[PDB]
Design a binder for this molecule. Structure first.
Ligand SMILES: [K+]
Ligand SMILES: [Mg+2]
Ligand SMILES: [Mg+2]
Ligand SMILES: [Mg+2]
Ligand SMILES: [Mg+2]
Ligand SMILES: [Mg+2]
Ligand SMILES: [Mg+2]
Ligand SMILES: [Mg+2]
Ligand SMILES: [Mg+2]
Ligand SMILES: [Mg+2]
Ligand SMILES: [Mg+2]
Ligand SMILES: [Mg+2]
Ligand SMILES: [Mg+2]
Ligand SMILES: [Mg+2]
Ligand SMILES: [Mg+2]
Ligand SMILES: [Mg+2]
Ligand SMILES: [Mg+2]
Ligand SMILES: [Mg+2]
Ligand SMILES: [Mg+2]
Ligand SMILES: [Mg+2]
Ligand SMILES: [Mg+2]
Ligand SMILES: [Mg+2]
Ligand SMILES: [Mg+2]
Ligand SMILES: [Mg+2]
Ligand code: NA
Ligand code: NA
Ligand code: NA
Ligand code: NA
Ligand code: NA
Ligand code: NA
Ligand code: NA
Ligand code: NA
Ligand code: NA
Ligand code: NA
Lengths: 114, 63, 112, 50
RNA sequence: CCAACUGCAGACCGUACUCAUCACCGCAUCAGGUCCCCAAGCAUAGAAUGCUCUGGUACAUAGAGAAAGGUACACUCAGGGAAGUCGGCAAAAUAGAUGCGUAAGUUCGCAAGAAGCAUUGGCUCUGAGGGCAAAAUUGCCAACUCAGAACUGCUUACGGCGGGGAAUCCAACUGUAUAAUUAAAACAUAGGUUUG
RNA sequence: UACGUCCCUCUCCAAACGAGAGAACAUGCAUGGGCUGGCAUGAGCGGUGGGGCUCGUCCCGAGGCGCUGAACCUUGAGGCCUGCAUGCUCAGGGACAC
RNA sequence: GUGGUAAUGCGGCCAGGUAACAAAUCAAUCCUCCCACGGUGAGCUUUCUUUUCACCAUAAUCCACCUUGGGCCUUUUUACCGCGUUGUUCGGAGCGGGGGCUCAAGAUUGAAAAAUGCAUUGUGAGUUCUGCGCUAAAGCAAAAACCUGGGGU
RNA sequence: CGGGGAAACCCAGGUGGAGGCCUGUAGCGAUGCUGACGUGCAAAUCGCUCGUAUGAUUUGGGUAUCGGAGCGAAAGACUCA
RNA sequence: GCAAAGAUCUAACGGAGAUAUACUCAACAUGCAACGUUGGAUACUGGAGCGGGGAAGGAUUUCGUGCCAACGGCACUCGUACACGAGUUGUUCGGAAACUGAGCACAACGUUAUAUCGUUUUGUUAGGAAAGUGAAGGAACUGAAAAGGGGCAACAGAGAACCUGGGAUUAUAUUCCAAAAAGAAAUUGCAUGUGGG
């Protein structure tokens, strides 16, 4: 509004950053429990950072432990994003039936059966 | 999408205007906006003591 | 979007049947009646008809149930005339009575 | 609509009560002549207008 | 006596449903008539017109299906262009917005959108037009409109939307007015005069 | 009794409906291929483009170029080729003659 | 009855007031729509989409007590110049500056009220009640009911 | 508010929002097709086209004036087909 | 003739409404056409609506269970049809109680052979005696002061003390809900305590 936009500026998208304190998200896959490696690879290869997919540098880190995938970041994200990506993965691997995602805590998603 | 394009100014040309110039942007609104801007500036200058009452009154009339 | 209905069995948009739109705790939009207002306590119409200081504009039952402070002032003619009118009347009374006394005394002194 | 006087309401109530068919044993009585009501009314044919 | 407190009491009639392409009037479940309130998104000047979420509906007898002749709220037509006809009836035709330009006449207000000529898409850019927070200085932010340029394209391609000019007769003008064959030059009108 | 004719079914030189011209295990019908014609270069992908954005590269961008006379359509109220390829038919049924 | 220099706090009869009344212009609150941030659920997913859709509520009645629009008080006095509106104007019959009194409409804090309802909290546009105090040879119904005072009792 | 003039006044730019003003919805009417229908959807309706649309405007309820009478911007119009 | 208002298709259930044969015969050429509910698909209305509420008018058309003779200009297993049984809840919402308006016309008087006629709001009946009770004092009675009789006419003018939630109906709801009234208020009359006086 204050400054007119340009079309060529769509090449670089700058993601807003937190003041301090990394936010952590967790996804539980205990109830459906091999697949963890595929899921982690899909997340680390599809997650977008400032525009580009795959090359996420070190601003976001992932880990699997006790059937729980963990994501820590200093970048301002939306919890909805890691539900969208998980639904994408479930569709690609053809299990969108009989499995569903539900928010349990303030920052954790959990898999479940229908 | 079209709203972002129009914000960059893309589909508002001579061949797309359909109503009158005053129907699209009335002149009374422009005049009121301008005159209020000028009066606000004059009042701020008089308060900050850049100009005196004698100069202020003349500028207020010419505006 | 939602649309509303009248609720008080009168369905005409006159100056006494004014309504407002309200959203309730149950998440619905209803119509509620807007109360009529009053112009307030005024100076006499032949003297200018100005709104009196220190008094409130209250409708029928509110004026009945309120206290005297709300509708009057502690001066003389409180809630009827204004301060300038009271001052003018005081000065006029005094000066006229003095003129009358002087004239009558002059007449009696000429007579005697 | 909503408004009607009580006298008019009572007249309409009497008409509603009258709008009934003949009981069956009346036709079995001795020397009987009545078969149908013949004073039946329908709201769509004839109007009372009160 | 004045206030609050507290106790008890708070009578009568209306209240279903409809309000209309089926509930009222028109012999009827009749393309006619009938007052009030609420009123979304996009295009656009928009309560114009076109399409859509919510709410509602698929009810108005259906099937097969190239005759002639019809009705239409449906279209096109080579060359000519009113030669048709009592008569350009009916159809066609003009058309938005912006810039330039505009005659005789005149009660000086108009005539006037007189007439007429030009431009318009898409894309990528540039300039102008403001506020509050600490000085003709620094940051942060909103809303759209106008103007200019380069590149690029047309099969002239939704809807909606004046044809124009020169004269003669009548009535000054806006208005009314034979419900069901006459809307006019008739009536009214402001202005003028007369009478009691 | 026989010869046969008509209806049902299929085709279109006929046709408002009747009537007509035909066939009745027949390249008859169906689908595909080739021809003949119509429009005008598909979806997708990729290394010239007025300009612009970030670290010699990497991206946003109408349009253009290549694959590409591509793609799609072509008998149907009924274009061609089996003197081009496959699939379906498996005792045709009824009424009169009588 | 009683405070404040004051504007004005607080505890029969007679005269006024409310009821009580046009247009236009401009501008609030409520409500509707849009946009930006988050949270919860559902949809699309050959490919693309930090994505598309829905939801995120607060009644009357009451306490305590900042904005902006009028009217006024006190103090220092205005040299035909000054104030002010989008707009047709105001001033020794008191402009402007300092400090105050009051009215109208809003805001905020809290009680109600989560114990309810369903499965957040910021911008821009539009619309009412409201305010801006009050054509014409056309100039804006009345009364009950109620309110305040002047007097006597 | 700007320019000119000795003076009377003259030329120009804004603001404002008047009018039985204009284009045009809803509303109120009814010009042409001499269209459709004309044993009709209808004992006067339908389609397109057309007049006007801040005013001598349109409309609900209440009230007041009738049969040789009433009312009428006047057509012998209207007074329950 | 039953042609304005664009339009329906499909499967599964339901139903007597069928897959209904003398046989031969696998089946077609010998039971057609049409109906309701649910799911899916495709369209229309398009906020001046085949949306949700009211007045005038109507008066049970409302709801549930059945039924399908007649009526719904074709059809029905369906109906605003037919039979049986049900449904409308108020201190505060609308009216009246209780305002005045354009207006009406009882009394009184006048007129008429005849009241079934006239006047009756420009403050205002009528040749016209139209007032019936405050305070009283010594429990009710009694009577001073007040010109201008009685009434009607607005469910859009004036007036008018209540709001949300409900898992609360087959059909009513700002009307129903019970001691934790789901609850929270406002107002009227009469009494009782407290304080002030
Ligand atoms: K009489
Ligand atoms: Mg209605
Ligand atoms: Mg009808
Ligand atoms: Mg529209
Ligand atoms: Mg030709
Ligand atoms: Mg020519
Ligand atoms: Mg000829
Ligand atoms: Mg013509
Ligand atoms: Mg004329
Ligand atoms: Mg032929
Ligand atoms: Mg205005
Ligand atoms: Mg006009
Ligand atoms: Mg004549
Ligand atoms: Mg026939
Ligand atoms: Mg037919
Ligand atoms: Mg017909
Ligand atoms: Mg549509
Ligand atoms: Mg429309
Ligand atoms: Mg029938
Ligand atoms: Mg039933
Ligand atoms: Mg019945
Ligand atoms: Mg009323
Ligand atoms: Mg009431
Ligand atoms: Mg109901
Ligand atoms: Na203007
Ligand atoms: Na009635
Ligand atoms: Na009801
Ligand atoms: Na006529
Ligand atoms: Na006009
Ligand atoms: Na005709
Ligand atoms: Na005919
Ligand atoms: Na039809
Ligand atoms: Na009267
Ligand atoms: Na009355």
């Amino acid at each position: 509004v204050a400054v007119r936009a340009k079309v060529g500026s769509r090449s670089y998208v700058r993601q807003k950053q937190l003041a301090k304190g990394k936010k952590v998200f967790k996804i539980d896959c205990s109830i459906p429990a091999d697949v963890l490696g595929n899921f982690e690879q899909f997340f680390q290869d599809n997650t977008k950072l400032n525009g580009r997919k795959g090359k996420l540098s070190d601003k976001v880190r992932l880990s699997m432990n006790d059937n729980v995938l963990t994501i820590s970041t200093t970048m301002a994200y939306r919890k909805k994003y890691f539900k969208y990506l998980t639904k994408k993965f479930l569709k690609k691997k053809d299990l969108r039936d009989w499995i569903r995602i539900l928010a349990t805590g303030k920052g954790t998603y959990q898999l479940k059966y229908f | 999408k079209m709203k972002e394009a129009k914000d960059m100014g893309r589909h508002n040309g001579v061949g797309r205007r359909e109503g009158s110039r005053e129907a699209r942007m009335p002149s009374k609104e422009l005049w009121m906006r301008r005159l209020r801007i000028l009066r606000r500036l004059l009042r701020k200058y008089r308060a900050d003591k850049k100009i005196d009452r004698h100069v202020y009154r003349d500028l207020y009339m010419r505006a | 979007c939602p649309r509303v209905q009248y609720r008080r069995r009168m369905h005409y948009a006159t100056r006494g049947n004014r309504m407002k739109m309200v959203r309730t705790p149950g998440n619905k939009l209803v119509m509620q009646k807007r109360a009529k207002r009053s112009q307030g306590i005024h100076t006499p119409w032949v003297l200018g008809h100005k709104r009196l200081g220190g008094t409130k504009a209250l409708r029928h039952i509110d004026a009945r149930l309120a206290s005297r402070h709300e509708k009057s002032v502690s001066r003389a003619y409180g809630g009827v005339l204004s301060h300038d009118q009271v001052r003018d009347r005081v000065v006029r009374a005094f000066l006229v009575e003095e003129q009358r006394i002087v004239k009558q005394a002059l007449k009696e002194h000429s007579k005697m | 609509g909503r408004f009607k006087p009580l006298a008019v309401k009572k007249k309409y109530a009497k008409k509603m009560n009258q709008n009934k068919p003949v009981p069956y044993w009346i036709r079995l009585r001795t020397g009987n002549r009545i078969k149908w009501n013949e004073k039946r009314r329908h709201w769509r044919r004839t109007k009372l207008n009160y």
